[PDB]
Amino acid sequence: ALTPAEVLFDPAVLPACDHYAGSEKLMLKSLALQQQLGPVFDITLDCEDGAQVGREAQHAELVASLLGSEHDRFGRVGVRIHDFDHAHWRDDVRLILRAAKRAPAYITLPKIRHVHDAAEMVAFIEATRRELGIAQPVPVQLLVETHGALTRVFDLAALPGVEALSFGLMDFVSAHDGAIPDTAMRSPGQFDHPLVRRAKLEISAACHAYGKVPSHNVSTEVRDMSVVANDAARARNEFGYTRMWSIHPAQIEAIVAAFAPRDEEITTATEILLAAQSAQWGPTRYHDTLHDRASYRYYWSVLRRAQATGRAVPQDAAPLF
Amino acid sequence: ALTPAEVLFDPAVLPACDHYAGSEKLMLKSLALQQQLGPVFDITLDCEDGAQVGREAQHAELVASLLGSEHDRFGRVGVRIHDFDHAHWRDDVRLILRAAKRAPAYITLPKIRHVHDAAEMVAFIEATRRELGIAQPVPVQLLVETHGALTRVFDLAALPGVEALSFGLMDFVSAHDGAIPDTAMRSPGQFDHPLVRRAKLEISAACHAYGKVPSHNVSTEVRDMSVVANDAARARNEFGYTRMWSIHPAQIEAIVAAFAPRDEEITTATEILLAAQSAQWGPTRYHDTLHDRASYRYYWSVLRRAQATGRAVPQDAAPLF
Amino acid sequence: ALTPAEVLFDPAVLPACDHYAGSEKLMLKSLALQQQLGPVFDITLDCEDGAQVGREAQHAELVASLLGSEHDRFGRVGVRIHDFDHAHWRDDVRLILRAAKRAPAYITLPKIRHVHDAAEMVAFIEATRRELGIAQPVPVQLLVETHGALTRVFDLAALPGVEALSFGLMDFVSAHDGAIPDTAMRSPGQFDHPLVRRAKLEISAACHAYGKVPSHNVSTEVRDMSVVANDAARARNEFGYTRMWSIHPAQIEAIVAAFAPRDEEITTATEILLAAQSAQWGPTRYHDTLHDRASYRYYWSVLRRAQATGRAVPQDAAPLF
Ligand SMILES: [Ca+2]
Ligand SMILES: [Ca+2]
Ligand SMILES: [Ca+2]
Ligand SMILES: [Ca+2]
Ligand SMILES: [Ca+2]
Ligand SMILES: [Ca+2]
């Protein structure tokens, strides 16, 4: 018989939590925690908004000293540098790429205003790593947190060296100069305020269109993890994000859990697909619902991801592989 | 006095139901039903997802044999062919246009990824019908059900030989590789899931912008017609669709009814417009509400459609024509 | 220590109410009311939909006679002229600019279909005022109330001589030829109908992206001011509009109040920023919530606007200036 892989029409993957640390104490504790939990979350060593101002050179060296060190056990430690209109952004790239025992897992670019700004920064990173004789290119992630970036967000998603786009909620709200209430930086405003909801969906649609990872902003709530876990669920199940920032180690497990695979999907996919197979991939009826190749795709996507990620697939599903 | 037609600033129309049949038995039963009900719905003879795979040539000939036959009583029978990246799509066009006693009412193109893909297919259809000496061009309808089509959906709406765009809900959800839950293929998820709601509104706005018909996806619910009728109402009254696909003959009357004209609108339009006329088309007050030429347009659109479609217009409305 | 102005990353302002009058009696009463209340609202002397048809030349002269007259006390009186596809639009510009003792505060262009249409009209206004030896250029405001304008609404926001975009709700609904129910011209439909909500957010995002004023459509409700006041609140707090049209003098105070500054914001901003300052503009904790430079921006925007507009700022905030 025919397999779904050969009859059905036609994805980006990074760890689901991006944990930010902007000071040495937090970096070291995060790194230690990553060793305990394993690489279920990335760590971003932050030079920008997560850090105080004034020690820019010293800070980039601190960051560089941790990359590929004894604390970086999995190679899942990236960085965020300064913005294009900042004096130290090239110095961040040079200091960090020169001194890091291993290159950062990715470089996060904040406050992109124009498409050319991002491309130029991506290009400088490539050039620098090329001359330092670094083996592979360094992935870049872009913040979409200005008017300019949101307007051209599809152009950003399309950029070659860019693996993900992240929403900058606070900067985006602040960018409206008070026209959007600060309640939009908290939940549920950050999901329900029409302009913020609109921006999040643009970023998400753009990422999916170009096979990039849509990364959700942090929850600034540092007490109620119940809120944080709910944010992560809405980002995932309503907004189509596949990753989310963390700003406190207690957020990490709530976020990772929210993005865990739903194993409940696997038996359903198996049943539907086996039946589809028997109907020669023509339309079928399942539980008062019509299915055809357009929905089969979904369930094959579900089975494919499950088997790939070494999740339990029913023996019945064998003739689909 | 002055008529609305001469003072007011400044539409596409197809049957409101597009009934799909992908097998001979269903095609023949649909055709028979169309003869009974008259052409209140179109029929699309389906070569793609509504049909099993493997008999592609035989299937296109079956389809071609029904077009303009004794069963095709009104010329309101179209087809859906294979996609641009499929081997048999040109063969579908040639086999069907060559053998059909009368050309299809339209040709539906599934899974458009790029604007050039669609244009090229539209162009091949024109060329083929031109060489076969077919008298008029064959209208094309495009599925918007990929990332590429949604991104450039306004460019699609603008294409010259394209009369309508249809939303492919299942393919669109599947296109997100699991990021959108399968609950978004069912109601109310298919209206309330932010990314699906977003896609539907883009397609709709694009169609209206370029005078094309926005055609809504089928309800996959084949038991509860109450659900199907509600879907059709939301597609119409919230999303601005003017047509909807049917996948089961029991859906057809629910869909056709949902898109029926609201005669309640006609007396209101008459009253408002006659009063506007007397105020020399300056602003008026009607029921605690201010009206001016911007709203008069709406009510003239309502009267114009009613009189055109031979619906009952009050004798009082005479000085508006 | 360091001030927010020197560490933080990175606005258009017009009166919050745009009161329309399309007849001499209403213009004169509006002008008198503006003298009483002071310039808390603009007045637009209307030649288009707010006026009856047929006296076009006489009407433009009436309008021109009031600009800069004894009734125009503050220079906050603009006009709306006819559309690009109208015969009298150039005549409106010439008659009005030639005869007005002082130039209009702005010129509102209705029913823009294409970007070039608007640019061309903006250019004619510049040319005319230049040859009449008028000292400064006349600001233009564009109506976004057609399909063509909404599609290219970001291109419109970007136009050099354009200070604001206004949503034309009734024309926009009417533009869909009945596909959008007339209930979308009333509240809550005008906020909740998905296509109208979508259009309003596009206009708003575009204006903010290019530093223009987003101006909300009028409430056509002329009895219940409670409705009007609620409309203004949703336009402001959900949709990000900073101005709203008025069509009845009783609407004016409800609209102006809805857009009044929230003084409650000032102490919060002060507290957060003073603390940020002490942490060397690194991240801080405030009330179970994490803050960093991305949110500080918001609160600095709040303080800056308060001090500028001569509102009461706490003595504690001194080291932030
Ligand atoms: Ca940010
Ligand atoms: Ca609590
Ligand atoms: Ca489909
Ligand atoms: Ca039931
Ligand atoms: Ca209007
Ligand atoms: Ca009342």
XYZ file of C-alpha atoms in Angstrom, chain A residues 144 150 167-176 179-204 216-217 239 241, chain B residues 194, chain C residues 197 201 204-205 237-240:
51
model
C 10.653 42.281 16.560
C 6.793 44.799 12.654
C 8.468 39.415 20.240
C 9.596 42.300 22.456
C 6.369 43.069 24.339
C 7.558 45.873 26.639
C 9.519 47.686 23.928
C 6.555 47.276 21.548
C 4.094 48.754 24.022
C 6.554 51.536 24.940
C 6.968 52.218 21.198
C 3.402 53.529 21.135
C -1.267 55.030 23.304
C -1.222 51.417 24.492
C -1.821 51.174 28.257
C 0.888 49.486 30.394
C -1.783 46.885 31.210
C -0.892 45.431 27.796
C 2.464 44.394 29.250
C 0.624 42.164 31.767
C -1.729 39.253 31.152
C -4.391 39.085 29.850
C -3.814 42.474 28.185
C -0.743 41.155 26.393
C -3.009 38.673 24.556
C -6.283 40.602 24.415
C -5.194 44.156 23.574
C -6.029 44.295 19.827
C -2.743 45.976 18.712
C -0.533 43.658 20.746
C -2.520 40.615 19.666
C -2.172 41.848 16.092
C 1.612 42.229 16.357
C 2.060 38.748 17.913
C 0.090 37.098 15.087
C 2.080 38.915 12.386
C 5.363 37.695 13.854
C 3.969 34.178 14.215
C 7.282 34.480 22.723
C 8.169 37.307 25.145
C -0.763 32.216 18.867
C 4.613 30.141 19.177
C -6.387 33.794 16.194
C -11.862 45.749 13.710
C -6.060 48.295 13.654
C -3.772 52.662 13.809
C -0.582 50.563 13.398
C -7.632 52.049 25.116
C -8.100 49.106 22.751
C -7.403 50.550 19.308
C -4.735 53.161 20.019
